[PDB]
Design a protein around this ligand. Structure first.
Ligand SMILES: CC(C)n1nc(-c2ccc(NC(=O)Nc3cccc(C(F)(F)F)c3)cc2)c2c(N)ncnc21
Length: 263
């Protein structure tokens, strides 16, 4: 197809990530546009299974979803996407920039992610792995949804009960994850359900347990989290709703908000 590009048109500057299935490099394309390059280690993982990740990024196109630029489908395979200068949201919240972010910036970030998922919602797709580690940050606190290839038309702590138990994954399963993602945003990336192993999380959540309101986080925002965590998937709000709620947050929900020590 038209996504295919020559190999000499790619220059891999410095490596950013290094998994087992491949690597991620910061590079240049056509000697001008800065890009993100994903490599596949032949032998370790197989093609098509590594290319399916791009088969879906071809349909999806939204300013809040990491955009696919080009590919090299003939092994050695290379995936080219837009470059997000600040890395993963998770590393961003935990690093040097974490101490300065306050609720208005963090809620704005949640609004962008929600906007991106509203697009996924409209297109009838399921992400299956929405979490801070799969969100990328660019210049001027821009956030975009991304992943490794689970988009379909043990992260138990981020996975809704009905999905982790009976494999029932829906856009409502993602809404549950967005709720967990909101706790990651308000605790500066702390692993959710602190001091609890997966087996405790499963038993507890089914038993009705839910994380409490994080310190300095408005109750109105924690209530939004709890809606995302309702046992019945159909009672959870849509991303269209969460997008509007978050964008209008400081005028319609917390018009009295006063900055604090951490939020
Ligand atoms: C943190 C570092 C290792 N890294 N990783 C990436 C990167 C981002 C996205 C992807 N893959 C991806 O977004 N896949 C994917 C697969 C299916 C569907 C989608 C969706 F359309 F939902 F975004 C996305 C791979 C590497 C990336 C990037 N683009 N820019 C700057 N740094 C980056």
């Amino acid at each position: 197809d038209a996504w295919e590009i020559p190999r000499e048109s790619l220059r891999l500057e410095v490596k950013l990530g290094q998994g087992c299935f491949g690597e991620v490099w910061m590079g240049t394309w056509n000697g001008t546009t800065r890009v993100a390059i994903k490599t596949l280690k032949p032998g370790t993982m197989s093609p098509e299974a590594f290319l399916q990740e791009a088969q879906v990024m071809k349909k999806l196109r939204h300013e809040k979803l990491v955009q696919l630029y080009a590919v090299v489908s003939e092994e050695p395979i290379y995936i080219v996407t837009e470059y997000m200068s600040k890395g993963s949201l998770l590393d961003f919240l935990k690093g040097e920039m974490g101490k300065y972010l306050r609720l208005p910036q963090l809620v704005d970030m949640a609004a962008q992610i929600a906007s991106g998922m509203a697009y996924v919602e409209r297109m009838n797709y399921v992400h299956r792995d929405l979490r801070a580690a799969n969100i990328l940050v660019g210049e001027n606190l821009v956030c975009k949804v991304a992943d490794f290839g689970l988009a379909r038309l043990f992260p138990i702590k981020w996975t809704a009960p009905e999905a982790a138990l009976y494999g029932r994954f829906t856009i409502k399963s993602d809404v549950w994850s967005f709720g967990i993602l909101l706790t990651e945003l308000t605790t500066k990336g702390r692993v959710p359900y602190p001091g609890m192993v997966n087996r405790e999380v499963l038993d507890q959540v089914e038993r009705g347990y839910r994380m409490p309101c994080p310190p300095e986080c408005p109750e109105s925002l924690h209530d939004l989290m709890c809606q995302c965590w309702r046992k019945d998937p159909e009672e959870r709000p849509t991303f269209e709703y969460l997008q509007a709620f978050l964008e209008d947050y400081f005028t319609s929900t917390e018009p009295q908000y006063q900055p604090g020590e951490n939020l």
